[PDB]
Design a protein around this ligand. Structure first.
Ligand code: NA
Ligand code: NA
Lengths: 258, 256
């Protein structure tokens, strides 16, 4: 009974004028009947969010939107950082936290991701909590255990009510940017284990409601068998999200077609 | 002479509505005649820049604006980062690089700051390159050498033409948000040392034109003595930049 979710992570691409054009094209390419069957959200750079807000609200589009990161702090002397309250006032629904690129390039560990998750929740945003193992962990066959500890650390101490407001994204690092998408059974194995660990972290009933996404080289050609898996509820899309035609097509596939 | 520069670093404060309100108030409070004697820029959070751009351009205000950070990378798979071309398209004039809060909380070293400086220059932005020593360095009397070392690292290998396009902000860490402003003579000591080092990294003529700011608990009461020093060309303002009247007053003081 979990509604599919497609989240388009633009990463560091597109100025505010290109952002408007991309969202216009996506909205025109994806017929409105599909939003009854799938949630579709675009996640632009911070500097683009205002422009996307005025478009989506002005035109009454059914796309939602979100941000690529958030500060763990409330307002204060944190030069360069963006607060949950700023994102909430812009009408963001989602915020990605702990993406692999930020865990590695900006030294975000599990405790930092937890603090960002809390800041998202305090401001009414839905955090997309990212986890995923490296090729070496995978090649050693210890990927399930690796992702479980990441999940435990990144949600540590949250109540059942709080966990019920998060989304989890499994993005194996070896699948980010590489054209090497996980097979459906690979995604299913880790996403099934994620939900099973959500049982202990916050009751079985909320475990069955939390949406778990696969991310990593997702496109219109591979999204179908991946999202079709019983424990995969959607996709965190990277490079495909910058291509209006492909992003709309893969979103419609995730919905189950017409 | 070098034209004074006042830069209001809002830090992580104000949503886009509050941003519109603050910029409107500053512009009303600082008469246009002052802009011939001082450059005044506001530096809002990324999410406020579109609203600030459209207001300043739309209502033809004389303030400029900038951002609080920029990526070293041109574009691509850097979730959460903002590129120099994104900022240039929004009409930003300045970008703060290497603020103490980012050097400490976000592990930005001299090499990262240099790369962000190059990305700023690549996109026609004016980087405000921040340097400054901690309390312990200062108490040992090692402050001048520490800041010169930081400066040489943050500009390593830049041409003289490229250095002429940067601004330097000396912000001792012990003065940031603490109310422990540097004395005028202490600010002059380091800012003069910075300009002296710029003569080596670039040239005498370039060093004579580069604007060197002081920051760290600046407000209307202490700005005058500090910016009146010969090698101090303005201020990088923290909390007072959020108070339109105070920010306008310290700007008018800086203009003479
Ligand atoms: Na599914
Ligand atoms: Na001066």
């Amino acid at each position: 009974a979990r509604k599919p979710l497609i989240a388009g992570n633009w990463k560091m691409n597109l100025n505010h004028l290109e952002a408007i054009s991309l969202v216009q094209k996506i909205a025109f390419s994806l017929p409105e009947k599909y939003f009854d069957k799938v949630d579709v959200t675009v996640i632009p750079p911070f500097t683009d969010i205002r422009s996307v807000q005025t478009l989506i609200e002005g035109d009454k589009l059914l796309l939602t939107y979100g941000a690529q990161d958030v500060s763990a702090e409330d307002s204060g002397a944190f030069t360069g950082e963006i607060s949950g309250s700023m994102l909430a006032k812009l009408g963001c629904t989602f915020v990605v936290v702990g993406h692999s690129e930020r865990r590695t390039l900006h030294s975000e560990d599990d405790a930092v991701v937890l603090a960002k998750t809390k800041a998202a929740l305090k401001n009414g945003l839905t955090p997309i909590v990212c986890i995923g193992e490296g090729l070496n962990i995978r090649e050693a066959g210890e990927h399930v255990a690796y992702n479980v500890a990441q999940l435990r650390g990144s949600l540590d101490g949250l109540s059942a009510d709080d966990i019920a407001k998060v989304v989890i994204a499994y993005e194996p690092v070896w699948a980010i940017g590489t054209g090497r998408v996980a097979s459906a059974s690979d995604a299913q194995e880790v996403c099934g284990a994620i939900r099973e660990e959500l049982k202990e972290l916050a009751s079985a009933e909320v475990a069955a409601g939390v949406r778990v996404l696969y991310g990593g080289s997702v496109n219109a050609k591979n999204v179908g068998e991946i999202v079709g898996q019983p424990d995969v509820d959607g996709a965190l899309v990277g490079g495909a999200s910058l291509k209006a035609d492909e992003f709309a097509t893969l979103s419609a596939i995730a919905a189950g077609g017409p």
